[PDB]
Nucleic acid binder design. Structure first.
Lengths: 91, 98
DNA sequence: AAATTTGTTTGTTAAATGAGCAAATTT
DNA sequence: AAATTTGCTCATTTAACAAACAAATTT
């Protein structure tokens, strides 16, 4: 049914799968909670910043540094991929 | 004085440790493990859409959550995400949030 | 009766793309 | 020594943008 998922344990020590989208809902339920109406500004860039980096690490780890297969896996262009590598100084 | 909160620490999730103790790990680690899990279970099948897959799994709840916050208001939501109100309206359509 | 937000459009800017190449690098 | 990937470039398609503004809505 749904492919991006993370392991959760309940009080009965049962491990169990739960979408990543549910974790993001939580990270942000929390983000806002701990603000007290202080303006947010760049939340799109913030969330994305934190999602691109682990995606890039993990697909470069998988494709043994091969930038070319990485781009093909992710479905982005070799250029794009490089640019993003510079952005996070991952090169 | 104020204490440093690194960017990893700004979006965080509730994890339990080897001592049955609740603690806040970065969201980025949850993304890392989602993908680890994902590769393990792939078994040499070709992939061609992993960016668009991760993006969809992430934008959908970023949107869902921000529009709850602005009690449905598209203008503030776009100001507070940092994107043009047109993109926002477009992304919202993309997932039928209207 | 405001003030704001929506829904839609326009022209402009910025980003992403594909193709091409020599020169490194892996095979 | 052949095959592939890198590190550029250029040019082209596509997305994101800010600025409008009448019509609907919320204050």
């Amino acid at each position: 049914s749904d492919v991006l998922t993370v392991s959760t344990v309940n009080s009965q020590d049962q491990v169990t799968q739960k979408p990543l989208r549910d974790s993001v809902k939580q990270a942000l339920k929390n983000y806002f909670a701990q603000l007290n109406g202080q303006d947010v500004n760049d939340l799109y860039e913030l969330v994305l910043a934190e999602v691109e980096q682990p995606l890039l690490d993990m697909v470069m780890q998988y494709t043994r540094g091969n930038q070319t297969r990485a781009a093909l896996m992710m479905g982005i262009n070799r250029g794009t991929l490089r640019k993003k590598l510079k952005k996070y100084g991952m090169n």
